[PDB]
Write a protein that binds this ligand. Structure first.
Ligand SMILES: [Zn+2]
Ligand SMILES: [Zn+2]
Lengths: 242, 242
């Protein structure tokens, strides 16, 4: 149903454009959020009653909440940054295999910091991942987006067009009265972080200033932006589209 | 002039679509080709008298040929694969800085194996690179392509839509009578490797079977495909568009 606007990444059927065209795919890069922060984001999406895909960074009992919910897909968020940062004892394989232990049998992946390479995608495919979510093409680039077949692993590359922290870096609006990014004729994948939904981030300086409080369940709420930000953007998007 | 169809990557002016729309950007990932192989590719493009951009992997006096030619732009092709392959003593910075020594002041980059990440692009930008050429969106994905502004470094991301070895993996045609990939309304960046132009590669098995001969100036020519392949595709594209 057209009215079923929200979908999971694994609902994309590359052979059937009806499975993605004009639809919205809410995705969440967990990024090591404390449990109270992740729980708040889960509660917000569960309250809307929509589908969503969650990319896991670490082990937490809240992953079981995500697994249970039939509207939610659990994927992985492997962190290969230490490989790029300087000398290291391991490669991609060890890190990927460890991350996959968080969601055995999953099919969707987005790399922390969008770390990607031909060999990385080859290794994703060997491990039976089917959807790569690592290409970010901005909604304002003038490009109508569509997922496409990768040349190996029967993988599908799924490009995404909006991200909360990226919106801060590009100075995109959090308080527009319409879905400026929306493509009725393309795929619409958005990426949110629980930390920014929790603090209603409108500037990364709020995020940086509050660093010491990000895991403090008593004080963090005091840093929530009361103007427009990531949280109010998500809340409006949900209200307008359910 | 519309008739000046061929351009260099650094000719892209993100503020002026006339600088890229409907134009063709021939790019060459040198990939450690022996000098006789690189020379053959240079001779072929020089014979056509068109612009081209060359991504350097290693030091060779032939880079000076590329620098001299005012129609040619020299960029870099850093190799970060060893970082992903397993334990390593260095990170991106050391490798990038060493590669940049091959073309000081250059502005364009494509990573070997399309290794990329947010921190990698940040580091490209700090080193005054302006054009990232690491996003490959296939010509047959149904997406009209345009370069776009990256969120840091005043960098421009330039997507490309065709590559010789990728054409083999996707089973794209080398002997079409028309430019099937061409977007009159988008940017058209193609990536060729000197080794495949030299051997007129139509299957990667030819490339793999001939491995021991890739630096043998006497025997390699015997492995050149006499049917349609990467070389005849490039030759036709040049003939049709000059
Ligand atoms: Zn992340
Ligand atoms: Zn290469």
């Amino acid at each position: 149903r057209y009215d079923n606007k929200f979908a999971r990444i694994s609902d994309i059927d590359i052979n059937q454009p009806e499975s993605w065209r004009g639809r919205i795919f809410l995705t969440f890069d967990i990024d090591w959020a404390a449990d109270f922060v992740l729980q708040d984001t889960i509660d917000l999406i569960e309250g809307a009653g929509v589908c969503a895909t969650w990319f896991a960074t670490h082990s937490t009992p809240l992953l079981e909440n995500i697994r249970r919910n039939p509207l939610f897909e659990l994927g992985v968020h492997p962190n290969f940054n230490p490989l790029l940062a300087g000398a290291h004892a391991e490669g991609v394989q060890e890190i990927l295999d460890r991350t996959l232990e968080l969601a055995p049998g999953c099919v969707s992946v987005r790399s922390h910091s969008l770390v990607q390479a031909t060999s990385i995608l080859n290794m994703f495919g060997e491990r039976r991942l089917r959807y790569d979510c690592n290409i970010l093409v901005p909604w304002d680039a003038g490009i109508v987006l569509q997922p496409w077949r990768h040349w190996t692993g029967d993988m599908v590359r799924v490009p995404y067009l909006w991200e909360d922290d990226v919106a801060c870096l590009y100075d995109w609006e959090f308080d527009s009265t319409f879905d400026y990014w929306y493509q009725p004729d393309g795929i619409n994948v958005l990426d949110f972080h629980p930390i920014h939904v929790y603090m209603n981030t409108e500037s990364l300086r709020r995020y940086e200033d509050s660093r010491e409080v990000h895991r403090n369940p008593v004080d963090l709420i005091r840093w929530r932006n009361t103007s427009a930000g990531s949280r109010t953007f998500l809340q409006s998007l949900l209200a307008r589209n359910i």
